[PDB]
């Protein structure tokens, strides 16, 4: 059997034993059924999965709550009395209420059940495999880059200049440097002196290393540890404190109503009996105990729905601020525009204009200059820039595809469409200077592969404004003449008319060394944007938020770019990238507002402006995707992270991510969070309403004559109804195509508005008025008849139900929406008049509640006089949309 080995004996012992130990193949790697093997015996690479859950002890947690051991209690007592009847209904009704609040319960514990599996490069069978870390046994090899995270316990057998994060792990913020040779025996006490093992977890901050597995999972200290760090968390969301502290204020309100009514019952009053159970039933009805339940559910609703649009978002409390944002940051490349270059428009030096046709990264395509067709060395000025922007390359095609960057691609293809591919390898590279974001050129220094014996040759490309500064001659008719200020000012002119067409520039220089080059020409490497992106960016702007472009381009094209999809009004400038290097964040504070244009830039300037951003009132939305872009995304409040092209760094230690890689799946999160806000107003709003009738009914039934017609068995159920499946069915709902166009909703903002309490008490004095309408007509001169509670219940229960009918969106009437799209709402309503019915008809129950017969045309009169607050609800809807039309028409 493979044995594992602890990190001490991998780090005393060279490779050449960890690899004779472990049977691990350095170059080769293992076999699929050798993997499969390791796996089926030591487990899979995840943390030991023992967690048991006792759903019993969950069932008999869902006890103890004050207020229905009071209830038990008053049920016990008067078991003790001499009834029998009321003592099985309350004890069948708190059976109910308990079960109800279990499956609730269950059903928030599997929605916060309800993000990825993380995924490393392995290589196996000597072929580098983009795979799963969970299924890494012991003993594969692992190939570390930048911004890799390490995926398990790696014995370090080939290391080039790393630098890895071992932060999270010891502490210490200055990142230590991995070494290959085995660490002496004296020196292994302290864990920071561990420098040729790579441990789980760890962040690999610069350098390429390739290592071996050697502990997975629970063979490793550090894994302890982490599994313990990071399993119990509670990251409580700031609208979830919001909605307890609403909750309790309203618990206390209640309670100081139910008091008061009490002592008024009290004074002129008999049978304490009745009225200590209708108290403890309007205690459990007015109170909400369903809040937390119902707004977790619905962020995890909503949550599922967003991450099936392909929009992955932790931190859960993040969810709370999505759609909140006010400005959202975008860079050129990736997110607002496709990661695709072709070259269309050739400028040489000589003043040669030449057009490249086909799209795509394939041999396809022709160059015309003048109408001739060039191929191969025809035109010496076209032919020296493509072999320069051969020969200074980076990027490889194969298969009609790229690997590497695709603005170097596209000179690959431009090079394959003139018929000059093999001509990379005709050239021996001996030095290289790459291309960075502070330097912006590339530079190759190089010979022939035939002919050695000429001097070396280096061709540099890159900007305009870095290229030209190292050139100081030029072409023109075959002869080499001196750069005076005049052709820089037409090159000027030049790169200005490209950009305007939303060409990206590049420039091209070649010369025996740096520093005399030649400048070659330029070319127009065209961008097509992504669809939709337009209207997307439209319709964001007209209302709320304001988006911004990061591309580090020139000005020109970007305007361009920003101009074609819509991004430039008529009040909008644009500030360059050294300009916000010498300037503090105060005084580009006062311009941040205006500009939405960012060229020139670099990620070092992003925490700055975010800076800026934080000065005045507002929340950033950044879209860092590549290195050194991490720590801007953890200083902004949230973080867009793409999947395709992201490195760990800026993934794990990040905020919400975008797989496949769009603008309008912000958009489409920011709709669903404020659908989320939405349905938890309209669940409040339904809740406080239907509380409030209850009480004033109360009220005005034991003032001070003509006892409340509801029962405690009655005003129960009806806090059955009230927070039951027809509650919560209100917190998950399929979202229209309205929030788009409102504005963002402020954070010192509450969730109680002006409007909403009118709405509240409108409808609950229609339900008071209902209520009486129908108890003075039910009798005349009769004291007390029963079927006047029949009456009176059935009456409430169906305002109650059409209520919660009128209550299934505040911005959206029932007439546009269907029986259907959270079809739920529908399935409680009609599981509701099913209980009702049957409440009504039963005699096993007539005897448990108080409703023992209806007529047909009572229920006829009671569903025809219920209507009156549908109809009013929507009416003031109609009116409301027909000031909003006429409000928006001037
Ligand atoms: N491989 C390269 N060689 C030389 N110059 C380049 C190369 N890639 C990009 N550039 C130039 O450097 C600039 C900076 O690129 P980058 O900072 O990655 O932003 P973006 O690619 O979105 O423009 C580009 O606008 C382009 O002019
Ligand atoms: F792809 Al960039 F700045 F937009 F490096
Ligand atoms: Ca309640």
């Known amino acids: 059997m493979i044995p594992v080995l602890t990190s001490k004996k991998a780090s005393e012992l060279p490779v050449s034993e960890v690899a004779s130990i472990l049977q691990a193949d350095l170059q080769n790697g293992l076999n699929k059924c050798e993997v499969s093997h390791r796996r089926a015996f030591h487990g899979w690479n995840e943390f030991d999965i023992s967690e048991d859950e006792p759903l019993w002890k969950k069932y008999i947690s869902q006890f103890k709550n004050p207020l229905i051991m009071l209830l038990l209690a008053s049920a016990v007592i008067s078991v003790l009395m001499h009834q029998f009847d009321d003592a099985v209904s309350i004890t069948v009704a708190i059976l109910i209420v308990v079960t109800v609040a279990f499956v609730q319960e269950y ?80 020196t292994n006490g302290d864990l920071a002196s561990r420098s040729n093992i790579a441990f789980m977890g760890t962040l690999v901050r610069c350098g390429k290393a390739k290592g071996v597995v050697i502990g997975t999972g629970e063979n490793s200290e550090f894994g302890e540890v982490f599994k313990m760090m990071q399993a119990e968390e509670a990251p409580k969301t700031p609208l979830q404190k919001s909605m307890d502290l609403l909750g309790k204020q309203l618990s206390f309100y209640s309670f100081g109503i139910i008091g008061i009514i009490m002592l008024v019952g009290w004074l002129l009053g008999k049978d304490i009996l009745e009225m200590f159970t209708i108290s403890v039933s309007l205690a459990v009805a007015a109170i909400p105990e369903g809040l937390p339940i119902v707004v977790t559910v619905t962020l995890a609703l909503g949550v599922m729905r967003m991450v099936k649009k392909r929009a992955i978002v932790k931190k859960l409390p993040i969810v709370e601020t999505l759609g909140c944002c006010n400005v959202i940051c975008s860079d050129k490349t990736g997110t607002l525009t496709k990661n695709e270059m072709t070259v269309t428009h050739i400028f040489t030096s000589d003043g040669l204009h030449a057009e490249v046709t086909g799209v795509g990264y394939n041999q396809f395509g022709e160059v015309i200059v ?17 072999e320069a922007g051969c020969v200074c390359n980076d990027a490889v095609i194969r298969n009609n595809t790229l690997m590497g960057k695709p603005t170097e691609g596209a000179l690959i293809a431009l090079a394959m469409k003139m018929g000059l591919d093999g001509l990379q390898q005709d050239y021996i590279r001996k030095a290289e200077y790459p291309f960075s974001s502070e330097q912006k050129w590339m530079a190759v220094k190089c010979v022939h592969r035939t002919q050695q014996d000429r001097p070396e040759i280096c061709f540099m ?70 669809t939709g992106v337009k209207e997307a960016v439209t319709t964001l702007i007209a209302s709320g938020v304001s988006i911004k472009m990061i591309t580090g381009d020139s000005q020109e094209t970007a305007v361009a770019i920003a101009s074609r999809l819509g991004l430039y009004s008529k009040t909008s400038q644009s500030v360059s990238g050294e300009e916000i290097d010498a300037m503090d964040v105060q005084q580009l504070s006062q311009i941040v507002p205006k500009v939405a244009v960012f060229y020139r830039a670099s990620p070092r300037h992003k925490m700055k402006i975010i800076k800026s951003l934080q000065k005045n009132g507002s929340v950033v939305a950044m879209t860092g995707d590549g290195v050194n872009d991490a720590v801007a995304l953890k200083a902004a409040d949230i973080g867009v992270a793409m999947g395709q092209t992201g490195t760990d760094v800026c993934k794990e230690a990040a905020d919400m991510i975008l797989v496949d890689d769009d603008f309008q799946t912000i958009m489409s999160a920011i709709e669903e969070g404020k659908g989320i806000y939405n349905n938890i107003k309209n669940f409040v709003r339904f809740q406080l309403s239907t509380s409030i009738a209850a009480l004033t009914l109360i009220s005005l039934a034991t003032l001070m004559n003509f006892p409340n017609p509801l029962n405690a068995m009655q005003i129960l159920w009806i806090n059955i109804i009230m927070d039951g499946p027809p509650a919560q069915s209100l917190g998950v709902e399929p979202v229209d195509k309205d929030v788009i166009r409102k504005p963002p909703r402020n954070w010192k903002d509450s969730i109680l508005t002006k409007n909403l309490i009118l709405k509240i008490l409108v409808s609950s004095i229609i339900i008071v008025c209902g209520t009486l309408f129908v108890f003075w007509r039910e009798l005349r001169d009769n004291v007390i008849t029963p079927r006047d509670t029949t009456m009176t219940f059935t009456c409430f229960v169906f305002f109650d139900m059409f209520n919660a009918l009128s209550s299934r969106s505040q911005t959206k009437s029932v007439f546009e929406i269907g029986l259907c799209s959270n079809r739920m709402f529908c399935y409680a309503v009609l599981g509701s008049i099913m209980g009702q019915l049957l409440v009504i008809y039963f005699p096993p129950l007539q005897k448990v509640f108080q409703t023992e017969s209806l007529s047909i045309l009572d229920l006829l009169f009671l569903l025809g006089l219920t209507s009156s607050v549908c109809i009013v609800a929507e009416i003031i809807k109609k009116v409301e949309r027909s000031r909003e039309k006429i409000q928006k028409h001037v």
Request: with cysteine.
């Open 107 to 186: 059903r928030s514990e599997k929605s916060l059940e309800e993000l990825v599996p993380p995924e490393c490069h392995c290589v196996r069978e000597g072929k580098l495999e983009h795979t799963l870390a969970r299924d890494l046994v012991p003993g594969d090899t692992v190939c570390l880059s930048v911004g890799d995270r390490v995926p398990a316990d790696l014995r370090l057998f080939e290391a080039v200049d790393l630098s890895i994060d071992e932060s999270s792990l010891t502490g210490e913020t200055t990142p230590c440097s991995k070494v290959t040779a085995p660490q002496p025996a004296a």
């Open 461 to 530: 490309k890159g900007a305009y404004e870095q290229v030209i500064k190292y050139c100081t001659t030029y072409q023109s008719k075959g002869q080499t003449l001196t750069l005076t200020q005049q052709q820089r000012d037409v090159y000027q002119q030049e790169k200005a008319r490209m950009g305007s067409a939303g060409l990206r520039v590049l420039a091209l220089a070649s010369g025996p060394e740096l520093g005399q080059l030649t400048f070659l020409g330029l070319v127009g490497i065209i961008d097509p944007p992504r």
């Open 370 to 386: 003048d109408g001739d067709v060039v191929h191969g060395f025809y035109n010496p000025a076209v032919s020296r820039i493509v």
